[PDB]
Amino acid sequence: SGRENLYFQGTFAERYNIVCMLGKGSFGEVLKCKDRITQQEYAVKVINKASAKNKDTSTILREVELLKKLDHPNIMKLFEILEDSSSFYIVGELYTGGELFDEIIKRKRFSEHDAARIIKQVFSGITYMHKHNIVHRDLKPENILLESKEKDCDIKIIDFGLSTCFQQNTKMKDRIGTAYYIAPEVLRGTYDEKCDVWSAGVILYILLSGTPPFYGKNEYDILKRVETGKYAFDLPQWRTISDDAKDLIRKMLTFHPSLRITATQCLEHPWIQKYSSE
Ligand SMILES: Cc1cccc(Cc2nn(C(C)(C)C)c3ncnc(N)c23)c1
């Protein structure tokens, strides 16, 4: 506050009013804001500039400008990236349905029909972004948002492409929770687009069984399992799950990424086709 500081807060404070805090997201705090002129509401992520991975701010702006030009119904739309001396402000579509993990906590397990509806949308988004050589790396249920509270609303993947630009919060809200979804080759420091197929496979495993494939009491124990890549469908929870579902998951959780299916192949898989409309 104060005239000088408000002036130096730059174009974001001029253009937008903060209505309320919405919660801590990866990389930064998310707030609901309003465009002062139009009164339309948006979500804004406020990211400390100390959290930039790239020391050249112009590269961050370029990256985000490329992401603004993209358009797919299962990818969050971005409208603006603004700055002041301390922070980046990324403004985009506001959602009100909460995240996919909230929905996992609520429902516990999803029928094959319901899981296929959700995961097909994830696959569609991933396929689209991969066609533009964008990798998520951090795909997890917390980065899959429900557009609204309406029944069967569209899901929206958030933060897709921002991991090249920003490092995680110093204080993260659920660090152990991130280990479940990370691809083994990402842990090794050598990733390409296939890591998003792995993460989506972990999500699908959880939707169907209610349990993670790589588990443990702490981050270390979970990551030790991920690193070996060994998992099973031995739980009674898998007893009556279709062979087709298990086949898709096996292909997605293939250890070597060169041998792992593509996102496009996931969409074509018989299990997804069984539940698609026409
Ligand atoms: C890059 C960016 C900017 C603003 C918001 C997000 C994701 C997001 N995150 N969150 C949380 C759920 C508050 C973390 C949102 N709530 C409502 N609408 C949203 N779009 C979000 C991502």
Numbering used by the authors: -8 to 0, 70 to 338
The authors write:
In an endeavour to address the void, our study spans the classification of the C. parvum kinome and the structural and biochemical characterization of representatives from the CDPK family and a MAP kinase. Like in plants and ciliates, the CDPK family dominates the apicomplexan CaMK group. Many of the C. parvum CDPK enzymes have already been identified including: CpCDPK1 (cgd3_920), CpCDPK2 (cgd7_1840), CpCDPK2A (cgd2_1060), CpCDPK3 (cgd5_820), CpCDPK4 (cgd7_40), CpCDPK5 (cgd2_1300), and CpCDPK6 (cgd4_3330). For some time it has been known that the CDPK enzymes control crucial functions including transcription, metabolism, ion pumps and channels, and the cytoskeleton.
Inhibition of CpCDPK1 was thoroughly investigated by screening with a series of compounds designed to exploit the small gatekeeper that is naturally occurring in CpCDPK1, but not in the other CpCDPKs. For example, similar to previous results, pyrazolopyrimidine derivatives are ineffective against kinases with bulky gatekeepers (found just downstream of the catalytic lysine in a Yoo*xooxGGELFxxI motif, where o is hydrophobic, x is any, and * is the gatekeeper), but CpCDPK1 is expected to be sensitive to such inhibitors owing to the presence of a glycine instead of the typical methionine present in the remaining CpCDPKs. Accordingly, over a dozen PP1 derivatives were found that inhibit CpCDPK1 with IC50's less than 10 nM. The activation loop, which moves closer to the active site in the 3MB-PP1 structure sits lower and retains an additional turn at the top of the α-helix G in the apo structure. The pyrazolo-pyrimidine in the PP1 molecule occupies the same space where the adenine in ATP is typically found, forming H-bonds with the backbone of Glu153 and Tyr155. N8 of the 3MB-PP1 is linked by a water to the activating Lys105. The large, hydrophobic methylbenzyl group of 3MB-PP1 sits deep within the pocket lined by Leu222, Leu138, Ile150, and Met136. In most other kinases, this pocket is ablated by the side-chain of a large gatekeeper residue. The exploitation of the gatekeeper in the ATP-binding site shows that opportunities exist for inhibitor design, as is the case for CpCDPK1 which has a glycine-gatekeeper and is inhibited in the nanomolar range by PP1-derivatives. Indeed, our crystal structure highlights how one of these inhibitors functions.
